[PDB]
Amino acid sequence: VLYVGSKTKEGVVHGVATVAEKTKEQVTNVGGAVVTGVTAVAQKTVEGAGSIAAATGFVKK
Amino acid sequence: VLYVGSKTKEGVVHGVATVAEKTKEQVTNVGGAVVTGVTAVAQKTVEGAGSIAAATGFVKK
Amino acid sequence: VLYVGSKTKEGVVHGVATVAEKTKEQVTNVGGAVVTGVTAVAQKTVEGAGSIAAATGFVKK
Amino acid sequence: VLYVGSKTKEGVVHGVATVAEKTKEQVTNVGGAVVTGVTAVAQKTVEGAGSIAAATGFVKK
Amino acid sequence: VLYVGSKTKEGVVHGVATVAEKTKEQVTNVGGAVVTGVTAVAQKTVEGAGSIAAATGFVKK
Amino acid sequence: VLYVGSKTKEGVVHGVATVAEKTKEQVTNVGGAVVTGVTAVAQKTVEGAGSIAAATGFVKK
């Protein structure tokens, strides 16, 4: 059971942002969802044994 | 059970954004969904053994 | 069971956006849906063992 | 059970940001969700023995 | 059971920030979620023996 | 049971920051979650036996 409510006159919002000028290699990496607004709500659930999650930037062999 | 409600006079919203001028390689990578508005809601569920998720930037052999 | 409601006088919204000036390689990559509006809602469900998801930027052998 | 409520006249929010000029290599890596707004709420649950999470910057073999 | 409430006239919030000019290598790494707003709430739970978490900067051999 | 309330005319908050001009290697690493606002709340729970947590800077072989 979840209840949320809100009131506002003004507002401005920014999520993820990136700038690069002269870089050779640059990485932005995310595993979940990305959710955005004046009001934002997010939920998840997983069931069963042996679950794995593996957020990784890069690999060189 | 989920309940959401909202009231507002003004607002401005931005999701994911990216700029690159002279970079050699650049990557933006996301594993879930992307949801955006003045009000935004998102939900997910997974069932059964041995679930896997593997969000990766890049690989070189 | 889900309930959502809204009232607003003015508003402006932007989804995913990209700019590249003189770059050699650039990649924007997404695994779910992209949903956008003044009000936005999204739902998903998966059933059965051995589910797999594999959002990857690029690969060089 | 969770209850939340808010009242505000003005506000400005920034989620995650990044600037890089002449660096050779640079990485931003995150394992969970990113959630943002004037009001933000986030929840997760996992059930089972073999549970693993492995957030890593990079590897060189 | 949790109850939270707020009233405020003005406010400014910055979550995570990072700036790099001429560095060879630079890493920011996080194991959980990132949550940010004028009011912010986060919760989590894990069930079952032998649970592992291993947030690491980098490895070389 | 937990209860929280607040009242404020003005406030400014910075979560985590990092600056590096000419360094060879710099690492910022965190094993938990990062949570930030004018009012902020965080909670965790683990049940079982034989748990491990291993937050580390870097390793060289």
From Swiss-Prot, chains A, B, C, D, E, F:
Sequence repeats: 6-20, 21-31
Chain intervals for the UniProt region annotation (4 X 11 AA tandem repeats of [EGS]-K-T-K-[EQ]-[GQ]-V-X(4)): 1-31
Chain positions recorded as Cu cation binding sites: 14
Residue positions, PTM Phosphoserine: 51
Places the protein is found: Cytoplasm; Membrane; Nucleus; Synapse
Tissue-level expression: Highly expressed in presynaptic terminals in the central nervous system. Expressed principally in brain.
UniProt PTM: Phosphorylated, predominantly on serine residues. Phosphorylation by CK1 appears to occur on residues distinct from the residue phosphorylated by other kinases.
Record's function text: Neuronal protein that plays several roles in synaptic activity such as regulation of synaptic vesicle trafficking and subsequent neurotransmitter release. Participates as a monomer in synaptic vesicle exocytosis by enhancing vesicle priming, fusion and dilation of exocytotic fusion pores. Mechanistically, acts by increasing local Ca(2+) release from microdomains which is essential for the enhancement of ATP-induced exocytosis.
Family the UniProt entry places it in: Belongs to the synuclein family.
Disorder noted: Genetic alterations of SNCA resulting in aberrant polymerization into fibrils, are associated with several neurodegenerative diseases (synucleinopathies). SNCA fibrillar aggregates represent the major non A-beta component of Alzheimer disease amyloid plaque, and a major component of Lewy body inclusions. They are also found within Lewy body (LB)-like intraneuronal inclusions, glial inclusions and axonal spheroids in neurodegeneration with brain iron accumulation type 1.
UniProt comment concerning the protein's domains: The 'non A-beta component of Alzheimer disease amyloid plaque' domain (NAC domain) is involved in fibrils formation. The middle hydrophobic region forms the core of the filaments. The C-terminus may regulate aggregation and determine the diameter of the filaments.
Subunit structure: Soluble monomer. Homotetramer. A dynamic intracellular population of tetramers and monomers coexists normally and the tetramer plays an essential role in maintaining homeostasis. Interacts with UCHL1. Interacts with phospholipase D and histones. Interacts (via N-terminus) with synphilin-1/SNCAIP; this interaction promotes formation of SNCA inclusions in the cytoplasm. Interacts with CALM1. Interacts with STXBP1; this interaction controls SNCA self-replicating aggregation. Interacts with SNARE components VAMP2 and SNAP25; these interactions allows SNARE complex assembly and integrity.
Name of the protein in question: Alpha-synuclein
Organism from which the protein derives: Homo sapiens (Human)
Full-protein interval shown: 37 to 97 of 140
